[PDB]
Design a protein around this ligand. Structure first.
Ligand SMILES: [Zn+2]
Lengths: 114, 95, 59, 60, 39
């Protein structure tokens, strides 16, 4: 039943909602509605696509301190291992965007030269 | 109260009309457009004048005006026997 | 236009990827060897039932 | 489906071998045209007339 | 009903036209279905 809902507005007052769901697997998904549909990409796909990240920069940004906090360090390696298991062919930033631009190519009306 | 009624209805039977609704109606309807130019109802269309008086014209069946015609039924020949969607669950069981 | 998305089988809604299997399994081959190779018997009874239906373009 | 079509799904290859042991003594989900349901159910109702004379009538 | 008689002449002098003949039977069903009900 859990989730983090943000409503982001652009500087031209046009909005966009990005809900962040929690699964019962340690899995966290990113939800958005583009045209009138609704798409569900995993979160560490985005977190590895935004900037050049290691898997400890993602760890430290969530586990700032309290390494000994056992609740957090166990939910999290069902989310870092869950990406390395499911997507072993996505190593750097310029290859996850290749994956992410491939699936969303039809919906954003992308041209054949992009 | 000065116009009494004699005969009276006492029970209603439900049934299914057979293939010979064609006997009570020899006024088939073919042309899908209902009117033409000069505002007239085209023959063989859905506003045909054998279905009741219409547009200040007498009825081709009753011979009566718009105030006194009961109106009559026509029929559209389906070329292939589609199923009745009410009874569709009750033939898919027998199928 | 036919099935170039494949975006519901990846990342989209749960009933959006249930309607791809609906729009394909309910869409049936109307050129099949069972149906087309015996479809002379179909039309050999339809003209009995569509006879008083006129065609014209003089109007 | 939603009240527009009826399909005749493919009898799997186990059961045709269970048919042909008696009859001697097509593709996946082929379509069924509307007139060929009538030609089945006309012949069934001609045969089971006794049971359907009382399924469909609650008074005598 | 008219459009399936328009295509009823396309076997009297005689594939692809049975992909529109079988398309007509679904929509001659889906029109009489939409005449009685609408859902
Ligand atoms: Zn009249």
């Amino acid at each position: 039943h859990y989730g983090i809902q943000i409503r982001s507005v652009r500087p031209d007052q046009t909005s966009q909602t990005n809900v962040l769901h929690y699964l019962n697997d340690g899995q966290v998904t990113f939800r958005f509605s583009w045209r009138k549909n609704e798409y569900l990409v995993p979160v560490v796909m985005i977190l590895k696509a935004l900037c050049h990240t290691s898997d400890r920069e993602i760890f430290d940004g969530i586990i700032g301190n309290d390494v000994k906090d056992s609740f957090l360090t166990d939910r999290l390696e069902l989310l870092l291992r869950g990406f390395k298991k499911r997507y072993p062919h996505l190593q750097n930033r310029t290859q996850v965007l290749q994956y992410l631009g491939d699936k969303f190519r039809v919906v954003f009306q992308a041209s054949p030269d992009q | 109260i000065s116009k009494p009624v004699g005969s009276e209805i006492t029970s209603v039977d439900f049934g299914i009309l057979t293939a010979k609704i064609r006997n009570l109606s020899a006024k088939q309807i073919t042309n899908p457009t209902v009117l033409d130019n000069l505002g007239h109802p085209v023959s063989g269309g859905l506003y045909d004048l054998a279905l009741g008086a219409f547009l200040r014209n007498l009825c081709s069946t009753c011979g009566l005006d718009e105030k006194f015609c009961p109106g009559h039924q026509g029929h559209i020949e389906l070329p292939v026997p589609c199923y009745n969607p009410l009874f569709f669950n009750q033939l898919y069981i027998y199928l | 236009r036919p099935s170039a998305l494949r975006n519901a089988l990846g990342e989209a809604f749960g009933t959006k990827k249930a309607k791809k299997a609906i729009a394909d399994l309910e869409r049936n081959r109307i050129d099949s060897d069972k149906l087309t190779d015996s479809a002379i018997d179909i039309v050999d009874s339809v003209r009995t039932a569509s006879k008083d239906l006129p065609t014209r373009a003089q109007l | 489906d939603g009240f527009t079509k009826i399909f005749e799904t493919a009898l799997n290859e186990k059961q045709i071998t269970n048919n042909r042991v008696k009859g001697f003594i097509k593709t996946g989900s082929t379509y069924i045209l509307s007139t060929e349901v009538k030609n089945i159910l006309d012949t069934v109702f001609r045969k089971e007339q006794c049971v359907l004379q009382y399924v469909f009538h609650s008074r005598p | 009903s008219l459009l399936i008689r328009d295509l009823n002449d396309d076997l009297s002098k005689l594939r692809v036209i049975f992909s529109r003949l079988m398309n007509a039977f679904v929509t001659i069903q889906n029109d009489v279905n939409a005449f009685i009900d609408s859902t």
